[PDB]
Amino acid sequence: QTTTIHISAAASLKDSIDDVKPLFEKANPTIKLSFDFGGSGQIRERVESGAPIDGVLLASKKDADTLIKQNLAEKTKEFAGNELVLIEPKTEANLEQLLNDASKIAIGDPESVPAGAYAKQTLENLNLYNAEKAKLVLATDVRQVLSYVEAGNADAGFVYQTDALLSKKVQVKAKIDEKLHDPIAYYSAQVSDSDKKEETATFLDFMNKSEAQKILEKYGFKAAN
Ligand SMILES: [Ca+2]
Ligand SMILES: [Ca+2]
Ligand SMILES: [Ca+2]
Ligand SMILES: [Ca+2]
């Protein structure tokens, strides 16, 4: 018979998973997928609260290590990478000058969103955090940061390179140097309390196979280092 498993993936994987799901369910007619997308840190809190999730897809090695240490997750596996960029709504201005003219700079919540955590490490390592400290607006996930800059409600925003590629309404004004922050790597894990570990193991391994790896490449994502 059919079996439904629920995966909690990061918000930055919303559009690439849209194409992975039909290819997986075709190759596995007995496993059906249910996805919820949001900030990885908030996905971490729900697993730590007893949420009935089978597997998770997180954009932070820190959030994955946290679930492993509490024996809430198991079998971690990096499957993708990404880069951080500064986007503005649609002059040879530098990053500091872009943040000077900006009145609202949208970043993910550094306490529950990796994209906001990577963006904070960039500003700290550039000696720019305290300068733009009072102008930051925290969001629920990186896709919310994209929605604010798209609508013009925010002057600048920090999103992933894959997020800016999917938007005609914004444009990249600065590519954050990858050394200015911890490596952006996506990880897959299995919630230990899941009753469907066999079925969830099929999908989590499917992400590291050739079919899912090419979807990430064509969507701008990077590979596991
Ligand atoms: Ca300066
Ligand atoms: Ca303010
Ligand atoms: Ca159980
Ligand atoms: Ca079972």
mmCIF file of C-alpha atoms and ligand atoms in Angstrom:
data_model
loop_
_atom_site.group_PDB
_atom_site.id
_atom_site.type_symbol
_atom_site.label_atom_id
_atom_site.label_comp_id
_atom_site.label_asym_id
_atom_site.label_seq_id
_atom_site.Cartn_x
_atom_site.Cartn_y
_atom_site.Cartn_z
ATOM 1 C CA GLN A 1 0.000 0.000 0.000
ATOM 2 C CA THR A 2 0.942 3.690 -0.004
ATOM 3 C CA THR A 3 2.741 5.356 2.903
ATOM 4 C CA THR A 4 2.997 9.100 3.533
ATOM 5 C CA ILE A 5 6.099 10.597 5.150
ATOM 6 C CA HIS A 6 6.385 14.230 6.234
ATOM 7 C CA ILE A 7 9.587 16.187 5.554
ATOM 8 C CA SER A 8 10.358 19.610 7.050
ATOM 9 C CA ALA A 9 12.719 21.373 4.642
ATOM 10 C CA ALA A 10 14.301 24.812 4.729
ATOM 11 C CA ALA A 11 12.548 27.653 2.926
ATOM 12 C CA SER A 12 15.357 27.964 0.361
ATOM 13 C CA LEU A 13 14.554 24.478 -1.014
ATOM 14 C CA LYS A 14 10.911 25.215 -1.849
ATOM 15 C CA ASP A 15 11.203 25.374 -5.645
ATOM 16 C CA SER A 16 13.809 22.643 -6.172
ATOM 17 C CA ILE A 17 11.860 20.128 -4.072
ATOM 18 C CA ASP A 18 8.832 20.969 -6.248
ATOM 19 C CA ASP A 19 10.537 19.018 -9.052
ATOM 20 C CA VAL A 20 12.198 16.330 -6.905
ATOM 21 C CA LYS A 21 8.874 15.137 -5.468
ATOM 22 C CA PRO A 22 7.252 13.869 -8.718
ATOM 23 C CA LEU A 23 10.458 12.107 -9.796
ATOM 24 C CA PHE A 24 10.778 10.372 -6.420
ATOM 25 C CA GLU A 25 7.135 9.300 -6.115
ATOM 26 C CA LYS A 26 7.337 7.910 -9.654
ATOM 27 C CA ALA A 27 10.350 5.767 -8.709
ATOM 28 C CA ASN A 28 8.677 4.798 -5.397
ATOM 29 C CA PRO A 29 4.942 4.173 -5.918
ATOM 30 C CA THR A 30 4.564 3.160 -2.242
ATOM 31 C CA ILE A 31 6.040 6.334 -0.686
ATOM 32 C CA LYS A 32 4.280 9.703 -0.853
ATOM 33 C CA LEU A 33 5.803 12.962 0.367
ATOM 34 C CA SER A 34 4.382 15.830 2.427
ATOM 35 C CA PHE A 35 6.526 18.957 2.739
ATOM 36 C CA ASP A 36 6.499 22.026 4.972
ATOM 37 C CA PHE A 37 8.978 24.846 4.390
ATOM 38 C CA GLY A 38 10.323 27.385 6.845
ATOM 39 C CA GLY A 39 13.338 28.565 8.767
ATOM 40 C CA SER A 40 15.732 25.783 9.707
ATOM 41 C CA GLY A 41 16.027 26.961 13.306
ATOM 42 C CA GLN A 42 12.250 26.901 13.661
ATOM 43 C CA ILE A 43 12.309 23.401 12.169
ATOM 44 C CA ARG A 44 14.848 22.561 14.878
ATOM 45 C CA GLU A 45 12.552 23.865 17.627
ATOM 46 C CA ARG A 46 9.599 21.784 16.410
ATOM 47 C CA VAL A 47 11.640 18.569 16.495
ATOM 48 C CA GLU A 48 12.722 19.559 20.014
ATOM 49 C CA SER A 49 9.031 20.061 20.893
ATOM 50 C CA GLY A 50 7.821 16.618 19.796
ATOM 51 C CA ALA A 51 6.427 17.500 16.374
ATOM 52 C CA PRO A 52 5.542 14.338 14.383
ATOM 53 C CA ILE A 53 8.093 14.877 11.605
ATOM 54 C CA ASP A 54 9.679 11.950 9.773
ATOM 55 C CA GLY A 55 12.682 13.685 8.216
ATOM 56 C CA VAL A 56 14.148 17.170 8.027
ATOM 57 C CA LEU A 57 16.195 19.155 5.508
ATOM 58 C CA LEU A 58 18.178 21.917 7.217
ATOM 59 C CA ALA A 59 20.366 24.702 5.829
ATOM 60 C CA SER A 60 22.682 24.752 8.865
ATOM 61 C CA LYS A 61 25.294 22.311 10.122
ATOM 62 C CA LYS A 62 24.815 23.848 13.578
ATOM 63 C CA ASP A 63 21.095 23.033 13.605
ATOM 64 C CA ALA A 64 21.799 19.482 12.417
ATOM 65 C CA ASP A 65 24.492 18.910 15.054
ATOM 66 C CA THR A 66 22.085 20.190 17.719
ATOM 67 C CA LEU A 67 19.451 17.561 16.904
ATOM 68 C CA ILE A 68 22.066 14.787 16.776
ATOM 69 C CA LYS A 69 23.514 15.674 20.185
ATOM 70 C CA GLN A 70 20.063 15.470 21.809
ATOM 71 C CA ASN A 71 19.486 12.110 20.046
ATOM 72 C CA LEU A 72 16.482 13.618 18.258
ATOM 73 C CA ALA A 73 17.924 13.092 14.763
ATOM 74 C CA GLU A 74 20.207 10.502 13.200
ATOM 75 C CA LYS A 75 22.188 9.886 9.999
ATOM 76 C CA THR A 76 23.253 13.375 9.008
ATOM 77 C CA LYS A 77 24.273 13.892 5.386
ATOM 78 C CA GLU A 78 25.272 17.014 3.463
ATOM 79 C CA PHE A 79 23.610 17.134 0.048
ATOM 80 C CA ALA A 80 23.917 20.724 -1.236
ATOM 81 C CA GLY A 81 25.619 24.071 -0.784
ATOM 82 C CA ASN A 82 24.798 27.708 -1.396
ATOM 83 C CA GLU A 83 26.168 31.248 -1.342
ATOM 84 C CA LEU A 84 24.922 34.488 0.189
ATOM 85 C CA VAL A 85 24.113 37.639 -1.796
ATOM 86 C CA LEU A 86 22.786 41.140 -1.188
ATOM 87 C CA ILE A 87 19.681 41.973 -3.220
ATOM 88 C CA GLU A 88 17.863 45.262 -3.767
ATOM 89 C CA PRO A 89 14.669 46.185 -5.636
ATOM 90 C CA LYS A 90 14.855 46.685 -9.385
ATOM 91 C CA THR A 91 25.956 53.340 -9.546
ATOM 92 C CA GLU A 92 29.242 51.555 -8.771
ATOM 93 C CA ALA A 93 28.471 51.475 -5.052
ATOM 94 C CA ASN A 94 30.286 49.132 -2.693
ATOM 95 C CA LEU A 95 28.580 46.934 -0.099
ATOM 96 C CA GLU A 96 29.135 49.494 2.667
ATOM 97 C CA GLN A 97 27.686 52.247 0.468
ATOM 98 C CA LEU A 98 24.699 50.049 -0.399
ATOM 99 C CA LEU A 99 24.019 49.551 3.316
ATOM 100 C CA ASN A 100 24.557 53.267 3.989
ATOM 101 C CA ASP A 101 21.809 54.403 1.607
ATOM 102 C CA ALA A 102 19.475 51.605 2.737
ATOM 103 C CA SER A 103 16.955 52.498 5.433
ATOM 104 C CA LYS A 104 15.669 48.936 5.969
ATOM 105 C CA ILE A 105 17.928 45.893 5.572
ATOM 106 C CA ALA A 106 16.002 42.617 5.683
ATOM 107 C CA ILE A 107 17.726 39.524 7.071
ATOM 108 C CA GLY A 108 16.455 36.272 8.481
ATOM 109 C CA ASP A 109 16.154 35.988 12.235
ATOM 110 C CA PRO A 110 19.723 35.018 13.232
ATOM 111 C CA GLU A 111 18.297 33.018 16.157
ATOM 112 C CA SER A 112 16.141 30.736 13.984
ATOM 113 C CA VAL A 113 17.117 31.377 10.328
ATOM 114 C CA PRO A 114 20.525 30.309 8.935
ATOM 115 C CA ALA A 115 20.421 32.888 6.127
ATOM 116 C CA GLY A 116 20.168 35.530 8.840
ATOM 117 C CA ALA A 117 22.959 33.846 10.789
ATOM 118 C CA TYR A 118 25.304 33.802 7.787
ATOM 119 C CA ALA A 119 24.413 37.432 7.049
ATOM 120 C CA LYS A 120 25.252 38.453 10.623
ATOM 121 C CA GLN A 121 28.643 36.724 10.461
ATOM 122 C CA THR A 122 29.331 38.629 7.232
ATOM 123 C CA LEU A 123 28.562 42.010 8.805
ATOM 124 C CA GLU A 124 30.587 41.209 11.934
ATOM 125 C CA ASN A 125 33.613 40.090 9.901
ATOM 126 C CA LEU A 126 33.287 43.293 7.838
ATOM 127 C CA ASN A 127 32.967 45.573 10.907
ATOM 128 C CA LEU A 128 29.525 46.627 9.673
ATOM 129 C CA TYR A 129 27.124 45.008 12.162
ATOM 130 C CA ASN A 130 26.981 47.825 14.721
ATOM 131 C CA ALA A 131 26.814 50.391 11.905
ATOM 132 C CA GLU A 132 23.689 48.856 10.331
ATOM 133 C CA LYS A 133 22.434 47.419 13.634
ATOM 134 C CA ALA A 134 19.386 49.681 14.015
ATOM 135 C CA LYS A 135 18.337 49.207 10.364
ATOM 136 C CA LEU A 136 17.920 45.413 10.327
ATOM 137 C CA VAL A 137 14.456 43.850 10.058
ATOM 138 C CA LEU A 138 14.267 40.193 11.082
ATOM 139 C CA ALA A 139 12.106 37.779 9.084
ATOM 140 C CA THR A 140 10.725 34.281 9.595
ATOM 141 C CA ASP A 141 12.813 32.714 6.801
ATOM 142 C CA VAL A 142 14.981 33.648 3.825
ATOM 143 C CA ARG A 143 11.959 33.509 1.502
ATOM 144 C CA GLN A 144 10.309 36.183 3.657
ATOM 145 C CA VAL A 145 13.410 38.347 3.187
ATOM 146 C CA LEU A 146 12.924 37.881 -0.557
ATOM 147 C CA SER A 147 9.241 38.852 -0.380
ATOM 148 C CA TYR A 148 10.009 42.091 1.479
ATOM 149 C CA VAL A 149 12.638 43.253 -1.021
ATOM 150 C CA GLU A 150 10.423 42.233 -3.957
ATOM 151 C CA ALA A 151 7.539 44.403 -2.724
ATOM 152 C CA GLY A 152 9.863 47.354 -2.083
ATOM 153 C CA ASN A 153 8.958 47.280 1.619
ATOM 154 C CA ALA A 154 12.677 46.784 2.369
ATOM 155 C CA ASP A 155 15.588 48.617 0.768
ATOM 156 C CA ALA A 156 18.109 45.758 0.942
ATOM 157 C CA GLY A 157 18.111 42.076 1.797
ATOM 158 C CA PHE A 158 20.396 39.086 2.280
ATOM 159 C CA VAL A 159 19.177 35.960 0.475
ATOM 160 C CA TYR A 160 20.794 32.924 -1.099
ATOM 161 C CA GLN A 161 22.096 33.009 -4.662
ATOM 162 C CA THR A 162 19.438 30.437 -5.577
ATOM 163 C CA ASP A 163 16.709 32.733 -4.221
ATOM 164 C CA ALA A 164 17.760 35.726 -6.333
ATOM 165 C CA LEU A 165 17.892 33.535 -9.455
ATOM 166 C CA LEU A 166 14.139 32.860 -9.155
ATOM 167 C CA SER A 167 13.142 36.546 -9.002
ATOM 168 C CA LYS A 168 12.702 39.042 -11.837
ATOM 169 C CA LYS A 169 11.709 41.806 -9.386
ATOM 170 C CA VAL A 170 15.078 42.036 -7.573
ATOM 171 C CA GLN A 171 18.727 42.032 -8.609
ATOM 172 C CA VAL A 172 22.016 41.079 -6.973
ATOM 173 C CA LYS A 173 24.140 44.091 -6.039
ATOM 174 C CA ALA A 174 26.832 42.204 -4.088
ATOM 175 C CA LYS A 175 27.999 38.585 -3.903
ATOM 176 C CA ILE A 176 29.062 37.903 -0.318
ATOM 177 C CA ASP A 177 32.544 36.405 -0.192
ATOM 178 C CA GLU A 178 32.235 32.843 1.089
ATOM 179 C CA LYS A 179 35.102 33.397 3.549
ATOM 180 C CA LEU A 180 33.094 36.101 5.363
ATOM 181 C CA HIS A 181 30.836 33.431 6.909
ATOM 182 C CA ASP A 182 30.710 29.779 7.875
ATOM 183 C CA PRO A 183 30.198 27.435 4.896
ATOM 184 C CA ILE A 184 26.577 27.316 3.750
ATOM 185 C CA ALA A 185 25.765 23.601 3.511
ATOM 186 C CA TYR A 186 22.410 21.817 3.499
ATOM 187 C CA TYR A 187 22.035 18.652 5.572
ATOM 188 C CA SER A 188 19.500 15.824 5.658
ATOM 189 C CA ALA A 189 18.588 13.944 8.828
ATOM 190 C CA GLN A 190 16.099 11.386 10.131
ATOM 191 C CA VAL A 191 14.008 12.192 13.199
ATOM 192 C CA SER A 192 14.607 9.382 15.680
ATOM 193 C CA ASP A 193 10.960 9.134 16.790
ATOM 194 C CA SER A 194 9.695 8.587 13.231
ATOM 195 C CA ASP A 195 7.741 5.351 12.842
ATOM 196 C CA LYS A 196 8.644 5.295 9.128
ATOM 197 C CA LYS A 197 12.434 5.118 9.140
ATOM 198 C CA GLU A 198 12.550 2.681 6.208
ATOM 199 C CA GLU A 199 10.423 4.923 3.985
ATOM 200 C CA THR A 200 12.156 8.151 5.029
ATOM 201 C CA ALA A 201 15.546 6.542 4.369
ATOM 202 C CA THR A 202 14.517 6.090 0.729
ATOM 203 C CA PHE A 203 13.878 9.809 0.235
ATOM 204 C CA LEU A 204 16.864 11.095 2.224
ATOM 205 C CA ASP A 205 19.148 8.887 0.132
ATOM 206 C CA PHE A 206 17.287 10.029 -2.995
ATOM 207 C CA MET A 207 18.511 13.586 -2.372
ATOM 208 C CA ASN A 208 22.144 12.468 -2.749
ATOM 209 C CA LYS A 209 21.492 10.587 -6.010
ATOM 210 C CA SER A 210 22.111 11.818 -9.544
ATOM 211 C CA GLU A 211 18.538 12.903 -10.297
ATOM 212 C CA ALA A 212 18.222 15.197 -7.272
ATOM 213 C CA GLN A 213 21.803 16.467 -7.608
ATOM 214 C CA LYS A 214 21.189 17.779 -11.140
ATOM 215 C CA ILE A 215 17.998 19.586 -10.094
ATOM 216 C CA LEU A 216 20.038 21.447 -7.478
ATOM 217 C CA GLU A 217 22.688 22.338 -10.067
ATOM 218 C CA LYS A 218 20.115 23.639 -12.552
ATOM 219 C CA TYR A 219 18.504 25.636 -9.717
ATOM 220 C CA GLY A 220 21.830 27.311 -8.896
ATOM 221 C CA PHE A 221 22.649 25.261 -5.793
ATOM 222 C CA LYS A 222 26.134 23.904 -5.150
ATOM 223 C CA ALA A 223 27.232 20.353 -4.382
ATOM 224 C CA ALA A 224 28.512 18.809 -1.168
ATOM 225 C CA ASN A 225 32.153 19.708 -0.553
HETATM 226 CA CA CA B 1 34.672 52.416 5.371
HETATM 227 CA CA CA B 2 15.209 50.954 13.750
HETATM 228 CA CA CA B 3 7.895 6.360 17.319
HETATM 229 CA CA CA B 4 7.551 1.193 9.911
#
